[PDB]
Design a protein around this ligand. Structure first.
Ligand SMILES: [Cu+2]
Ligand SMILES: [Cu+2]
Ligand SMILES: [Cu+2]
Length: 506
């Protein structure tokens, strides 16, 4: 049992360029086995880190800044987490990596395609690898992005090992809004972990009470960590000044969804979603945050000087939350003296509505969340009962707008992520699950519900709840090529709830 709120929240340093000109910014990031202490009372933990850090360095760019990152593997040839050899079938290395800039409006060969992996020093490369140095032209709205490993059949492990980091796009136009900035703009990467007494990470090599059918190790369909970390520390505290802060909240956990509140009942102000500023600020007492979602929020500590306020969590993982463990994320202490006047603002009017768009609907895809069961008895989670390797069926035309209607007859929520694009949420609508399973027929049991205000901006990872049809609309561009869409519960993604998405150009 690890005592809460005894370590200061780390704030990862901003990565510095290896070279930089007006025309181009060039970075190098090397994946390394490293060691860091995750809590005061734990021995140091073995981890895989971008530049030896967990989380990796925060990367800061401007809109349209012409960025290059050479992501390099300098990792050991064997993994320290349990590899399931049965889920994926010219011998390949055991350890493979590839970096996805999540939310990036990125050319396809710089997107971190799962089969564009590489081993150490690029010695072996996957069949879709094209380049060492990834290109991020950043021709997109200011927003909270994040970067993480995306390698075929290894994503859950490589991310759990520590390969996650923040990437912020600043649009200079935003600066007139005078949102809290500099030291008052802080990323919060939330990752749940289970840690052994000797400090080493625990990741299960099989489900609990394994049928002796199962290979060993075997993938599991879900992972819930006993402990919550923010920016690489267990249940940390952050000293803040009694003023407005902006927080870039990122769910970088494998499976766990959070439902966040402040334990004094105080409110957040949501200013942004995955795809950038909301049209209007939204005052919220709590919010849901599934894997890979980002909330850009203001918290105003002005009236709370001296207080300790816990960022709390009501969502369970595999059970009800426990008040003494996973009900806690971190603790704010409003005890830092003001370094200057708070000149920041919490404005109402942030940006254009998505509905200012009037694109023609080129196509409507109906998609279902399902799966089968393998030789060993395990669930294999599938998008439209296709395997990753089946020929591509999601094939939007570049420059066109589609509506995707995602049908979820399963028992749980799935956070669905589309690469390249951000999209708008149209509505959700409940249906008869038994009927749909029995007949394939979709019968609605209620009217369509528009998105809550949090989802009236631009999203790239979206919760598809059980027993609902979710509809989204996306314009596919500006690049054509081979991308992916998938569930972002990593245990599902790897087996095998991920499909190719080809954006075609005549
Ligand atoms: Cu992602
Ligand atoms: Cu899923
Ligand atoms: Cu992805």
């Amino acid at each position: 049992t690890l005592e809460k709120f005894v370590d200061a929240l780390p704030i990862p340093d901003t990565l510095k360029p290896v070279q930089q000109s007006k025309e181009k910014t060039y970075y190098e990031v090397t994946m390394e086995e490293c060691t860091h202490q995750l809590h005061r009372d734990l021995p140091p933990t073995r981890l895989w880190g971008y530049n030896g850090l967990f989380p990796g360095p925060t990367i800061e760019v401007k809109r349209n800044e012409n960025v290059y990152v050479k992501w390099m593997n300098n990792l050991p040839s064997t993994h320290f987490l349990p590899i399931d050899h049965t889920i994926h079938h010219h011998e390949e290395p055991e350890v493979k990596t590839v970096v996805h800039l999540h939310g990036g409006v990125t050319p396809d060969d710089s997107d971190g395609y799962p089969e564009a992996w590489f081993s150490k020093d690029f010695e072996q490369t996957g069949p879709y690898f094209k380049r060492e140095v990834y290109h991020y032209p950043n021709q997109q709205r200011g927003a909270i992005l994040w970067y993480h490993d995306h390698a075929m059949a290894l994503t859950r492990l490589n991310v759990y090992a520590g390969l996650v980091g923040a990437y912020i796009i600043h649009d200079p136009k935003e600066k007139r809004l005078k949102l809290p900035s500099d030291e008052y703009d802080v990323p919060l990467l939330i990752t749940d972990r289970t840690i052994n007494e000797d400090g080493s990470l625990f990741y299960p090599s099989a489900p609990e009470n394994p049928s002796p059918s199962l290979p060993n190790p075997s993938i599991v369909p879900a992972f819930c960590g006993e402990t919550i970390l923010v920016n690489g520390k267990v249940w940390p505290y952050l000293e803040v000044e009694p003023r407005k802060y902006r927080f870039r909240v990122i769910n970088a956990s494998n499976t766990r969804t959070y439902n966040l509140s402040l334990d004094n009942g105080g409110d957040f102000i949501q200013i942004g979603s995955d795809g950038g500023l909301l049209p209007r600020s939204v005052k919220l007492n709590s919010f849901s945050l599934a894997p890979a979602e980002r909330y850009d929020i203001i918290i105003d500590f002005t009236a709370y000087e001296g207080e300790s306020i816990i960022l709390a969590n009501s969502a369970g993982c595999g059970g009800d939350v426990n008040p003494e463990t996973d009900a806690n994320i971190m603790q704010f202490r409003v005890t830092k003296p003001l370094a200057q006047k708070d000149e920041s603002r919490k404005p109402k009017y942030l940006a254009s509505y998505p509905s200012v768009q009037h694109e023609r609907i080129q196509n409507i895809r109906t998609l279902k969340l399902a799966g089968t069961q393998d030789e060993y008895g395990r669930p294999v989670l599938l998008l439209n009962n296709k395997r990753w390797h089946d020929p591509v069926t999601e094939t939007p035309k570049v420059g066109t707008t589609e509506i995707w209607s995602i049908i979820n007859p399963t028992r749980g929520t799935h956070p669905i992520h589309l690469h390249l694009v951000s999209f708008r949420v149209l509505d959700r609508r409940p249906f008869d699950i038994a009927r749909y399973q029995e007949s394939g027929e979709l019968s609605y049991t209620g009217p369509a519900v528009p998105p809550p205000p949090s989802e009236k901006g631009w999203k790239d990872t979206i919760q598809a709840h059980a027993g609902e049809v979710l509809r989204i609309a996306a314009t596919f561009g500006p690049y054509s090529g081979r991308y992916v869409w998938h569930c972002h519960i990593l245990e599902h993604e790897d087996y095998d709830m991920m499909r190719p998405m080809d954006i075609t150009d005549p």
